[PDB]
CSV table of N, CA, C and O and ligand atoms in Angstrom, one decimal:
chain,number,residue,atom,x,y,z
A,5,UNK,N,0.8,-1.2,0.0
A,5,UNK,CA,0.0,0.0,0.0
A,5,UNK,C,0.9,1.2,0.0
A,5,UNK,O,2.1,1.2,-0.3
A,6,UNK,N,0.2,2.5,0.4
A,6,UNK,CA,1.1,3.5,0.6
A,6,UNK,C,0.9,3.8,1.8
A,6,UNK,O,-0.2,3.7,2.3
A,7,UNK,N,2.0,4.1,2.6
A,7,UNK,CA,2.4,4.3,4.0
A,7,UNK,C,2.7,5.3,4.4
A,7,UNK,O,3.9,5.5,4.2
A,8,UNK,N,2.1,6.6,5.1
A,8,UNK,CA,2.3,7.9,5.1
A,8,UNK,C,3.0,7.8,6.3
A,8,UNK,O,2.9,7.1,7.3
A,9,UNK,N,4.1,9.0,6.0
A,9,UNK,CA,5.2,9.0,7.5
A,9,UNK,C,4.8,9.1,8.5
A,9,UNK,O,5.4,8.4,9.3
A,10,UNK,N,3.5,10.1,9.0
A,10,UNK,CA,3.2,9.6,10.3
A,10,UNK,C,3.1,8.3,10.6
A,10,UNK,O,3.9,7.8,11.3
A,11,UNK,N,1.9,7.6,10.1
A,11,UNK,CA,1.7,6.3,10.1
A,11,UNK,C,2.6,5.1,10.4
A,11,UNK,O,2.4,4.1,11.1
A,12,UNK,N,3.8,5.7,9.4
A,12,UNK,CA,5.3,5.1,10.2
A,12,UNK,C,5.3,5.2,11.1
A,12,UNK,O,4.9,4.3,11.8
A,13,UNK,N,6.0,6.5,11.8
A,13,UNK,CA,6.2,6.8,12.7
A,13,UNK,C,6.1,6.3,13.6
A,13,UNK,O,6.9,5.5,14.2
A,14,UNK,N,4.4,6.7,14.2
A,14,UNK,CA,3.6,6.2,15.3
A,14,UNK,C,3.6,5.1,15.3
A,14,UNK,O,3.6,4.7,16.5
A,15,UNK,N,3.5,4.0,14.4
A,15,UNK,CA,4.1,2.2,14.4
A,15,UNK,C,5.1,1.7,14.6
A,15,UNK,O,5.2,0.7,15.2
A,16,UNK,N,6.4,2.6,14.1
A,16,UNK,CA,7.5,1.8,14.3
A,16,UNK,C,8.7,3.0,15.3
A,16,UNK,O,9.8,2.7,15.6
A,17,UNK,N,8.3,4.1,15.4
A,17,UNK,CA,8.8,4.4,16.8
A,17,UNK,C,8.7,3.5,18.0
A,17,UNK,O,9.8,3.0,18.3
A,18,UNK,N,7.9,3.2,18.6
A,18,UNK,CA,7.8,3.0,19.5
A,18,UNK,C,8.8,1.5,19.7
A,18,UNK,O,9.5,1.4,20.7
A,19,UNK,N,8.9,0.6,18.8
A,19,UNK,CA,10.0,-0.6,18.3
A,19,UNK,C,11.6,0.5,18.6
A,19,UNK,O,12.1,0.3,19.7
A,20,UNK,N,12.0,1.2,18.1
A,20,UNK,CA,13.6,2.0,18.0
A,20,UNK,C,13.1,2.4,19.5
A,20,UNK,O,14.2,2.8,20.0
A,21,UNK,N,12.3,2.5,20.3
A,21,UNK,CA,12.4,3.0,21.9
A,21,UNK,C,12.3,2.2,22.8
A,21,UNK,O,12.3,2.5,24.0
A,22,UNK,N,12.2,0.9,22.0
A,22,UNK,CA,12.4,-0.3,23.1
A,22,UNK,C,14.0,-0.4,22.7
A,22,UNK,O,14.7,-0.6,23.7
A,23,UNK,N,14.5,-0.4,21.7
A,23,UNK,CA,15.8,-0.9,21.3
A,23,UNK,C,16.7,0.2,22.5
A,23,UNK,O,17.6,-0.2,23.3
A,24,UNK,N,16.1,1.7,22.5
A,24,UNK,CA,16.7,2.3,23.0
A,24,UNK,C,17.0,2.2,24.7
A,24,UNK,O,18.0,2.4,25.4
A,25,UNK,N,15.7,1.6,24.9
A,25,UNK,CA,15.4,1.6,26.6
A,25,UNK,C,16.4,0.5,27.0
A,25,UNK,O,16.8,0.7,28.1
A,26,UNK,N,17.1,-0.8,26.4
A,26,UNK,CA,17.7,-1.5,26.6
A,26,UNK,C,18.9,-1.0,27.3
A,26,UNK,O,19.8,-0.6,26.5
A,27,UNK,N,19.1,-0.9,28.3
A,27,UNK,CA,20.8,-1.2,29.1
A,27,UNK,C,21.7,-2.2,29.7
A,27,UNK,O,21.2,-2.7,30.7
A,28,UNK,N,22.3,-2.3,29.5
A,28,UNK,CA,23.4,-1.8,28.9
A,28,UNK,C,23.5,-2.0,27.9
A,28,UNK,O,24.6,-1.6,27.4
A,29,UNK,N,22.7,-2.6,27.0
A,29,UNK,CA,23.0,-3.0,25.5
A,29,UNK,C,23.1,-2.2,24.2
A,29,UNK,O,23.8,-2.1,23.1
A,30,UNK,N,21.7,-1.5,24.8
A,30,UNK,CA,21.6,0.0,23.7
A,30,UNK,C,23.0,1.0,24.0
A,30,UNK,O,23.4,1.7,23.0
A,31,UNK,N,23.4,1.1,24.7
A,31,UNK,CA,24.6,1.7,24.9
A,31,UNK,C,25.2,2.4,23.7
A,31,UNK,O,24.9,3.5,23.3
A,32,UNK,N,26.5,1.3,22.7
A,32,UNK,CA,27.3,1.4,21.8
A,32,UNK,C,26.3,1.5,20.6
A,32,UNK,O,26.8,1.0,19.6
A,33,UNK,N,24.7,2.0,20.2
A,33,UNK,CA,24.0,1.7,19.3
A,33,UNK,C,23.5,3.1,19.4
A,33,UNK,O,22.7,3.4,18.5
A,34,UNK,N,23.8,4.0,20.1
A,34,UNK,CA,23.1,5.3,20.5
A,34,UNK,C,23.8,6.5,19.7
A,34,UNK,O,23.2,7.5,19.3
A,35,UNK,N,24.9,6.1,19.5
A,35,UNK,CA,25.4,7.2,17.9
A,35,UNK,C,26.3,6.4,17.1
A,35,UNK,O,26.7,5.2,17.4
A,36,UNK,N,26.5,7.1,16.1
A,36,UNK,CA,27.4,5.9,15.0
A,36,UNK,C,28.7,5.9,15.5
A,36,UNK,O,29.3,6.8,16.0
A,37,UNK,N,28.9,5.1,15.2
A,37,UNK,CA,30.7,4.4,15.9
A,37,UNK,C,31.6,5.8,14.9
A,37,UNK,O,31.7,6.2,13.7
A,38,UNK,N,32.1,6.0,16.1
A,38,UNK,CA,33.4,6.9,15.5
A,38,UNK,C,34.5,6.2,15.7
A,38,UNK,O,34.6,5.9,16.9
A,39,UNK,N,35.3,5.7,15.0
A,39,UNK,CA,36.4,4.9,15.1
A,39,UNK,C,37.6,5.9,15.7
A,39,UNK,O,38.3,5.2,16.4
A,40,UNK,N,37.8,6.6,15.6
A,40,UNK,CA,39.1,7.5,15.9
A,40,UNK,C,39.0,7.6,17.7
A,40,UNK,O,39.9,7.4,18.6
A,41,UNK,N,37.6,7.9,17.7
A,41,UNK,CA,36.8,8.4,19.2
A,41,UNK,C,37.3,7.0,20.2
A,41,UNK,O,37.7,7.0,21.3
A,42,UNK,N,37.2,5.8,19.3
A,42,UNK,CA,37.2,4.7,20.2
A,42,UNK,C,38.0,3.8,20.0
A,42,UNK,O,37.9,2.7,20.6
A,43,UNK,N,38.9,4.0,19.0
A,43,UNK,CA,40.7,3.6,18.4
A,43,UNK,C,40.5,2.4,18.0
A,43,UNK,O,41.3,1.5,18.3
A,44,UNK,N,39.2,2.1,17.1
A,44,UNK,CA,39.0,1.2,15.9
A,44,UNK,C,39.0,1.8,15.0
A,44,UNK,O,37.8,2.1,14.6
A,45,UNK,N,39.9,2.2,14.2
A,45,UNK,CA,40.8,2.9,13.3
A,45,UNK,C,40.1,1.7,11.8
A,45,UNK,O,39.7,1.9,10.6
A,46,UNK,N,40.1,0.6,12.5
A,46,UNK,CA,40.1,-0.3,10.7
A,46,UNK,C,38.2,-0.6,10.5
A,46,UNK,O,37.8,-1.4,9.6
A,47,UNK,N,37.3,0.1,11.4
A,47,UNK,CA,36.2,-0.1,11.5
A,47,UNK,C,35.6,-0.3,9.9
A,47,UNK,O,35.2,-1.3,9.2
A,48,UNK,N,36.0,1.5,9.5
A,48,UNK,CA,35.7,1.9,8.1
A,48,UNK,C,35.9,0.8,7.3
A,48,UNK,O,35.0,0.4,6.5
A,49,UNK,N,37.1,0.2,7.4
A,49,UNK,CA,37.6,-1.3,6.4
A,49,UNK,C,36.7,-2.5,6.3
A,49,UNK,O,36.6,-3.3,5.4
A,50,UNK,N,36.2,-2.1,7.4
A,50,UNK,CA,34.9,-3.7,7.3
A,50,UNK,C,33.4,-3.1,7.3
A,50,UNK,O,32.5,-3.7,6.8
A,51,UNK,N,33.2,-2.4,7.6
A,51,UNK,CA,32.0,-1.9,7.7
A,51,UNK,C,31.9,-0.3,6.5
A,51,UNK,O,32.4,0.9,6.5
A,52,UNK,N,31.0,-1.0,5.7
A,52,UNK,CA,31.0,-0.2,4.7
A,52,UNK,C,29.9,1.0,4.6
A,52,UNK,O,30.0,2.1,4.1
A,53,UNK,N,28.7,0.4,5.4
A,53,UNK,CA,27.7,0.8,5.5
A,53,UNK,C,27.1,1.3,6.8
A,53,UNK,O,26.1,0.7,7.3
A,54,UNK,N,27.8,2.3,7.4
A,54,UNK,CA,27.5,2.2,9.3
A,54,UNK,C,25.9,2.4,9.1
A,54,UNK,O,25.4,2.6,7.9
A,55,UNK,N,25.2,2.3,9.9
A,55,UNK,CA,24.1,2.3,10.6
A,55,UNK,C,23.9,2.0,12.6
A,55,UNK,O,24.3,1.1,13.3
A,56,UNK,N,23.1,3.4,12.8
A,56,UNK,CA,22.8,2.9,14.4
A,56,UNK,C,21.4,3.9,14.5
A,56,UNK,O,20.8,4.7,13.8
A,57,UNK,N,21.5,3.3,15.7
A,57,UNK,CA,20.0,4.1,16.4
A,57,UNK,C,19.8,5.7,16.1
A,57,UNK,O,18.6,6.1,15.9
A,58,UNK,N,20.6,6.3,16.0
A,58,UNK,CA,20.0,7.9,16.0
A,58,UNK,C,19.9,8.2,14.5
A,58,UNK,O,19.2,9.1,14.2
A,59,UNK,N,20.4,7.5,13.5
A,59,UNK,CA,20.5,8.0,11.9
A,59,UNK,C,18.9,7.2,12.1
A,59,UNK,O,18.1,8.1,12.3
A,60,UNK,N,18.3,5.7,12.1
A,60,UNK,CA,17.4,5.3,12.0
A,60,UNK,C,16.0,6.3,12.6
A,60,UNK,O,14.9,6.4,12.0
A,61,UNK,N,16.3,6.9,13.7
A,61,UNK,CA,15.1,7.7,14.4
A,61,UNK,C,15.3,8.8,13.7
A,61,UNK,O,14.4,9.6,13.8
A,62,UNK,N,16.2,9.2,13.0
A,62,UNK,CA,16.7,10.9,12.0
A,62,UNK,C,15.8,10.4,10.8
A,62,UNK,O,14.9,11.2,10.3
A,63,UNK,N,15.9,9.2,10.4
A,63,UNK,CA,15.1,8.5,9.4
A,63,UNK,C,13.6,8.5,9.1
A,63,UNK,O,13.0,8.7,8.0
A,64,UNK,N,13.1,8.0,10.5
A,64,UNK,CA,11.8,8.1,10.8
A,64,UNK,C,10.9,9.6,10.5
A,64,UNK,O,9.9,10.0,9.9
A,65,UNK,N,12.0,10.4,11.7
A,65,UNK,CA,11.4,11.7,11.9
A,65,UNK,C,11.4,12.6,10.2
A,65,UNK,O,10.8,13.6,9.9
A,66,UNK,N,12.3,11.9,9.5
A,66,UNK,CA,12.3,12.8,8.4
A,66,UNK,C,11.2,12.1,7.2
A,66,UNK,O,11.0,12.8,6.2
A,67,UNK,N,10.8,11.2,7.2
A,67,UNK,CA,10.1,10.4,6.2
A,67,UNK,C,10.8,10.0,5.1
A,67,UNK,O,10.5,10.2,3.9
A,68,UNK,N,12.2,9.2,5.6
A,68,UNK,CA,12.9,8.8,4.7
A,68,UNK,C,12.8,6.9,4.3
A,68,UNK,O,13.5,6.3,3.4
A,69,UNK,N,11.7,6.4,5.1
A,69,UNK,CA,11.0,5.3,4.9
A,69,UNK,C,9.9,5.0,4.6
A,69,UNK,O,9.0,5.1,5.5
A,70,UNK,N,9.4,4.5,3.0
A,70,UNK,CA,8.2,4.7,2.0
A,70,UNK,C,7.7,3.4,2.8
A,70,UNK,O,6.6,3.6,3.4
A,71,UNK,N,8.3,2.1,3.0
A,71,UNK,CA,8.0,0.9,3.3
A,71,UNK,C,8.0,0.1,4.8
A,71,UNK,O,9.0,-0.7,4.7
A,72,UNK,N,7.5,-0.1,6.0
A,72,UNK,CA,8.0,-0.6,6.7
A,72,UNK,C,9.5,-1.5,6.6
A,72,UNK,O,10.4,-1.3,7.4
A,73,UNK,N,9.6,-2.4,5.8
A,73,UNK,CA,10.6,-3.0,5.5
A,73,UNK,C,12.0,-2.5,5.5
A,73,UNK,O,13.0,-3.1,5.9
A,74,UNK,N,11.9,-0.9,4.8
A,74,UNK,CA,13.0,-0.2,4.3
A,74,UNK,C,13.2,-0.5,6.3
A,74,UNK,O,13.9,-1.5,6.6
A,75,UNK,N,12.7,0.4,7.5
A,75,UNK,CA,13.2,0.3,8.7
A,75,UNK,C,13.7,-0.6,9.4
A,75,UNK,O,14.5,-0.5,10.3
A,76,UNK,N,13.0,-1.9,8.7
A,76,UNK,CA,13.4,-3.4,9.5
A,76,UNK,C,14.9,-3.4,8.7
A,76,UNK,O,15.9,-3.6,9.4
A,77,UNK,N,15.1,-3.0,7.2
A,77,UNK,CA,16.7,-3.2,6.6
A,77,UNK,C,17.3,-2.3,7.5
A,77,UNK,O,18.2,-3.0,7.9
A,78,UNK,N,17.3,-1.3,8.0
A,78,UNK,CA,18.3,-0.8,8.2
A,78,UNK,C,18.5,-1.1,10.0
A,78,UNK,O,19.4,-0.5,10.6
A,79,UNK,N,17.6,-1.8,10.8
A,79,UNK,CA,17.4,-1.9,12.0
A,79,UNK,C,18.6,-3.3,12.0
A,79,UNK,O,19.3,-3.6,13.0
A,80,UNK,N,18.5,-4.1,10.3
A,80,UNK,CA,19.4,-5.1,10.6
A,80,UNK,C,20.9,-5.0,9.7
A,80,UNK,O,21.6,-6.0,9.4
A,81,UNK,N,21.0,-4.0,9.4
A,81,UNK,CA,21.8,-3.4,8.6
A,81,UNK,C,22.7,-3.2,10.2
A,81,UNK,O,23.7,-3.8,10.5
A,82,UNK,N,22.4,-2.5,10.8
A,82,UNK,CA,23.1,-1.5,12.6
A,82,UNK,C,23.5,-3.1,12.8
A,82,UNK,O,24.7,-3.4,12.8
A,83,UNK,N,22.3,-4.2,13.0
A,83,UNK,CA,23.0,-5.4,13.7
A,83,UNK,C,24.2,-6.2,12.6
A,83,UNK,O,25.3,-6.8,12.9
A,84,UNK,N,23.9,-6.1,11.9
A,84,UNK,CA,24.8,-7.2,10.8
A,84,UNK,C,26.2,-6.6,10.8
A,84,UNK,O,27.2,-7.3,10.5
A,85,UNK,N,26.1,-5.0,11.1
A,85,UNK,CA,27.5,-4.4,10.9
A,85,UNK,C,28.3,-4.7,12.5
A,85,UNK,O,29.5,-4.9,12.4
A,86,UNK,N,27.7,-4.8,13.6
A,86,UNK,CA,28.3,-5.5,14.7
A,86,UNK,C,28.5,-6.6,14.7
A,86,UNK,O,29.6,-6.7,15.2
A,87,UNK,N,27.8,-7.9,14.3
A,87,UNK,CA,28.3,-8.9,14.2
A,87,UNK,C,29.2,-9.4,13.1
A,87,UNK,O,29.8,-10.5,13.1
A,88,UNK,N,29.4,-8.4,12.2
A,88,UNK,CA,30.2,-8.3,11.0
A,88,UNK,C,31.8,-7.9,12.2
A,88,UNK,O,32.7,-8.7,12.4
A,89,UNK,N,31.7,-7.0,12.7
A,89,UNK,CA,32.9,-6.4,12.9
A,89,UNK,C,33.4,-7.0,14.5
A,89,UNK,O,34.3,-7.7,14.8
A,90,UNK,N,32.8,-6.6,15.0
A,90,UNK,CA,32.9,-7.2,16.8
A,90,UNK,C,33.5,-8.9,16.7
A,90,UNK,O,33.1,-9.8,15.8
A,91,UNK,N,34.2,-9.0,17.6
A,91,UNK,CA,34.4,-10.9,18.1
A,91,UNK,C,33.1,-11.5,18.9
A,91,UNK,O,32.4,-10.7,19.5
A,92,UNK,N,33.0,-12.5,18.8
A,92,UNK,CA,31.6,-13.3,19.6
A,92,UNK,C,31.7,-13.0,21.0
A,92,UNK,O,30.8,-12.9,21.8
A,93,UNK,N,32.7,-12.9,21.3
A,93,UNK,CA,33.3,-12.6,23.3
A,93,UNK,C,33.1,-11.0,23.6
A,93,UNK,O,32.8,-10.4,24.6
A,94,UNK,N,33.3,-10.4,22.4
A,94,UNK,CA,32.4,-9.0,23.1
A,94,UNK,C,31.6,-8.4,23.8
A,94,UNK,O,30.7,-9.2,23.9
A,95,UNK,N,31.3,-7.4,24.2
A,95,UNK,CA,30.4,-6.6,24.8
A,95,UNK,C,29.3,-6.3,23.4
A,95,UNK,O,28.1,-6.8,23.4
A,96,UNK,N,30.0,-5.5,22.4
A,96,UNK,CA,28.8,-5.2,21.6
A,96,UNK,C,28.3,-6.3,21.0
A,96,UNK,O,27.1,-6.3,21.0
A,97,UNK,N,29.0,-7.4,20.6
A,97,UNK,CA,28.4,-8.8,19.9
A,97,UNK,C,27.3,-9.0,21.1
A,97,UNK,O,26.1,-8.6,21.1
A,98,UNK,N,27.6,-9.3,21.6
A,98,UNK,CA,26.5,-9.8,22.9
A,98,UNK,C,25.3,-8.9,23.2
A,98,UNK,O,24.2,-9.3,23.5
A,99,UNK,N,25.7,-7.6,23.0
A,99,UNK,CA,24.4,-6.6,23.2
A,99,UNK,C,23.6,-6.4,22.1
A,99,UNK,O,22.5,-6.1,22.2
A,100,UNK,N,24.5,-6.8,20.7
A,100,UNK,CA,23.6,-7.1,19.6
A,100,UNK,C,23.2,-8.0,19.7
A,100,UNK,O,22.0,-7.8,19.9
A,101,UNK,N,23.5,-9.2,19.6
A,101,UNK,CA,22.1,-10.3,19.7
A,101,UNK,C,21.1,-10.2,21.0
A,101,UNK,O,19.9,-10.6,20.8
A,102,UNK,N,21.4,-9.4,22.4
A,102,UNK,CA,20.2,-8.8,23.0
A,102,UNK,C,19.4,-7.9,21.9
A,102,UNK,O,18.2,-8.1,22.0
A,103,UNK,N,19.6,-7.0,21.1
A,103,UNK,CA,18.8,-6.1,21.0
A,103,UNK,C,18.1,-6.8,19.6
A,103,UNK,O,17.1,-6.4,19.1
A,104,UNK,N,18.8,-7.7,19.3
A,104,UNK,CA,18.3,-8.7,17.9
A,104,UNK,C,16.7,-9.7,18.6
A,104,UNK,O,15.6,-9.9,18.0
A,105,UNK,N,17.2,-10.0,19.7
A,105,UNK,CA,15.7,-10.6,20.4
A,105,UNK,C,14.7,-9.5,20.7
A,105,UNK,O,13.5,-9.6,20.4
A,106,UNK,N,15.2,-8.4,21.4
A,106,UNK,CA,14.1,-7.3,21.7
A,106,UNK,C,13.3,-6.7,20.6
A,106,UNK,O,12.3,-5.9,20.6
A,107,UNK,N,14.2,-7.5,19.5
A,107,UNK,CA,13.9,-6.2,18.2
A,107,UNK,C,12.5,-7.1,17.2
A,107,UNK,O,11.5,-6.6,16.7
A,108,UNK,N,12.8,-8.4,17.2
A,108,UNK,CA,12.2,-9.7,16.8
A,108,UNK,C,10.7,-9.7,17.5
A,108,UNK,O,9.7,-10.1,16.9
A,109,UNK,N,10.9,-9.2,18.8
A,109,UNK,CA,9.9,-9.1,19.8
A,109,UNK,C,8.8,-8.1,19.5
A,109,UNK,O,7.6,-8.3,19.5
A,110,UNK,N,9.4,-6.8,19.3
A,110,UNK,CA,8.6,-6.2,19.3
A,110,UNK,C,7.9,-5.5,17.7
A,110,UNK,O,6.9,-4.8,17.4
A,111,UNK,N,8.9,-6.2,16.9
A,111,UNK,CA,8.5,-5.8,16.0
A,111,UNK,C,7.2,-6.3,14.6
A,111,UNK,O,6.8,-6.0,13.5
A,112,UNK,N,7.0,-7.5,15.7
A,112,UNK,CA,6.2,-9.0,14.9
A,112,UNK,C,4.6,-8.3,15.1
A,112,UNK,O,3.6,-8.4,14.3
A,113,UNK,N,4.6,-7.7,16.3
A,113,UNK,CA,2.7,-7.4,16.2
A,113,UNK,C,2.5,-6.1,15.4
A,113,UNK,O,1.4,-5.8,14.9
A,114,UNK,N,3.4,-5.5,15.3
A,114,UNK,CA,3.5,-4.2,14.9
A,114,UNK,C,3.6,-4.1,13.2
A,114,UNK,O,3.1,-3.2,12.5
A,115,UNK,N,4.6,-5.4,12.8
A,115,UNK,CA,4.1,-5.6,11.4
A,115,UNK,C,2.9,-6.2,10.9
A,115,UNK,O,2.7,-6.4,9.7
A,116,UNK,N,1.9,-6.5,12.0
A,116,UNK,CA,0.6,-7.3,12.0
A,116,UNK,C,-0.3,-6.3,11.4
A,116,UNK,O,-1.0,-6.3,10.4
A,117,UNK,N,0.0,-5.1,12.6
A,117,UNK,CA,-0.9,-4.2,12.5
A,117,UNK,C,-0.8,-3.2,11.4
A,117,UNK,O,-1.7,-2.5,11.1
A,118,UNK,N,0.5,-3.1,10.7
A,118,UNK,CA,0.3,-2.1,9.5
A,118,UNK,C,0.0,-3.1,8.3
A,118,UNK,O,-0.1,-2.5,7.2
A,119,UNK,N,-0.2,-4.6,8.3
A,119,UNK,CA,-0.8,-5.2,7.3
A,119,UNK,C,-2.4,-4.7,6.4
A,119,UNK,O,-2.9,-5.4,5.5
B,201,UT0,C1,34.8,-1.6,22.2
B,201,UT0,C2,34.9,-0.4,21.3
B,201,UT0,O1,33.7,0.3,21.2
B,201,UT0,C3,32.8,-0.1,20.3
B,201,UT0,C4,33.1,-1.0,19.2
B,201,UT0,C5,32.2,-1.3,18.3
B,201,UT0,C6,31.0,-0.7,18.3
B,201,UT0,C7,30.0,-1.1,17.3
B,201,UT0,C8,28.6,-0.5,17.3
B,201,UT0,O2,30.3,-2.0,16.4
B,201,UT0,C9,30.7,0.2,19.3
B,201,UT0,C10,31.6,0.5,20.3
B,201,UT0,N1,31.3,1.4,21.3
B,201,UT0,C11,31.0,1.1,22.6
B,201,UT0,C12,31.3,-0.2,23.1
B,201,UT0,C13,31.0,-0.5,24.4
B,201,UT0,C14,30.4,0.5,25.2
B,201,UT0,C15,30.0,0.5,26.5
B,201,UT0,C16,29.5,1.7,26.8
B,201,UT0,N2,29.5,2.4,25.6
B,201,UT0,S1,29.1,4.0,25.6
B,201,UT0,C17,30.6,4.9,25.8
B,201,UT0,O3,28.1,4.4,26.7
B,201,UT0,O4,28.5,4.3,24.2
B,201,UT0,C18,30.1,1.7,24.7
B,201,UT0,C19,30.4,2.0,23.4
């Protein structure tokens, strides 16, 4: 169908504010990785395409998602680029697969409801 940005919004906000409410996990997801800031210098090298929580909600608020789907790509776009780059023993690996269940969770009735 067509999907007007409010309509976004008010559906799939509320999903990016549970991602957000998570602690400690939302943590490293709350601005984009600055590599220099946090002396992963070779970030850029593996990760081609950053994505995190505040470009996604910059996203929302601007109506830069025609499709529900476009938000779920880039919700796993933020995760694929942590498990792309992080070791499995990390902090962020590990807070990403928390916020990969939170996200699974809350985003299943919500794609019900814009059916
Ligand atoms: C370990 C090098 O750091 C990272 C590496 C990779 C990635 C990504 C998103 O692939 C993000 C971080 N940043 C990060 C990590 C942990 C914590 C804990 C609190 N915070 S914080 C200051 O409250 O934002 C953290 C910020």
């Amino acid at each position: 169908k067509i999907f007007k940005p409010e309509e976004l919004r008010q559906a799939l906000m509320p999903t990016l504010e549970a991602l957000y409410r998570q602690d400690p996990e939302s943590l490293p997801f709350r601005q984009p990785v600055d590599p220099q800031l946090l002396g992963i210098p070779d970030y850029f090298d593996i990760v081609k395409n950053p994505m995190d929580l505040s470009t996604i909600k910059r996203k929302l608020d601007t109506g830069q998602y025609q499709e529900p789907w476009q938000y779920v790509d880039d919700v796993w776009l933020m995760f694929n680029n942590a498990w792309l780059y992080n070791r499995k023993t990390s902090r962020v690996y590990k807070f990403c697969s928390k916020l990969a269940e939170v996200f699974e969770q809350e985003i299943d009735p919500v794609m019900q409801s814009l059916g």
